[PDB]
């Protein structure tokens, strides 16, 4: 359960409005970019204000470039006091099976590898904002790899 699971526990603060707290109950299958593998973290280290540099929050093509400096993890259950995510690299669960959620506009298949991409699509950049805390959660998009290479390819060619 250290090797099988790994319960990295994102703590939830005290002051969150019940419309904002119940907005996190629809954050089940997500991707959270943990900077380290600490067993106790805060939302500020998860939210986009951790991602921002000095004065500069980068664009979507740069938003890839510190995902791979971090540790993607998937939310397992949203308790009222905490949010638990197992890191992908260490160990998945007891049985080793976690559930995601298609925030894609794209249907998946069995057996295909799934790459996660920043919210690049139109009508899609939906960041669950904490109004009670002034925090945004830029949830990436799980995509099929025959798309997720082309979508990077269109962005690199655009620059």
């Amino acid at each position: 359960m250290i090797t099988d699971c790994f319960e990295a526990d994102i703590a939830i603060p005290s002051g969150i409005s019940r419309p904002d707290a119940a907005a996190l109950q629809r954050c089940e299958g997500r991707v959270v970019f943990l900077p380290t593998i600490r067993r106790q973290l805060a939302l500020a280290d998860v939210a986009h204000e951790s991602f921002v540099s000095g004065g500069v929050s980068p664009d979507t093509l740069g938003l890839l470039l510190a995902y791979r400096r971090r540790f993607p993890a998937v939310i397992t259950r949203v308790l009222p006091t905490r949010i638990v995510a197992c890191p992908v690299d260490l160990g998945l669960t007891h049985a080793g099976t976690v559930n995601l959620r298609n925030t894609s506009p794209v249907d998946l298949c069995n057996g295909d590898p799934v790459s996660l991409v920043p919210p690049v699509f139109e009508g899609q950049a939906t960041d669950v904002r904490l109004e009670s805390l002034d925090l945004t959660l830029r949830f990436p998009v799980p995509l099929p790899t025959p798309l997720a290479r082309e979508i990077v390819a269109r962005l690199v060619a655009r620059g």
Binding site: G15, R18, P80, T81
Partner: protein, 49 residues
């Protein structure tokens, strides 16, 4: 020829258990226990003024 070594004895220390009540500072508290807190999300306190 005869020689030896020795221990001239061991010394331990005693932790001092400190009850918060023993402190004079408990005057500022009023110490009451939730048998259950962790469940609580947002509690309020309400009293007439």
């Amino acid at each position: 020829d005869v020689e030896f070594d020795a221990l001239l004895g061991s010394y331990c220390n005693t932790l001092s258990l400190v009850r918060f009540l023993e402190l004079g500072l408990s005057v500022a508290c009023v110490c009451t226990k939730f048998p259950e807190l962790a469940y609580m999300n947002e509690g309020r306190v309400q009293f007439e003024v």
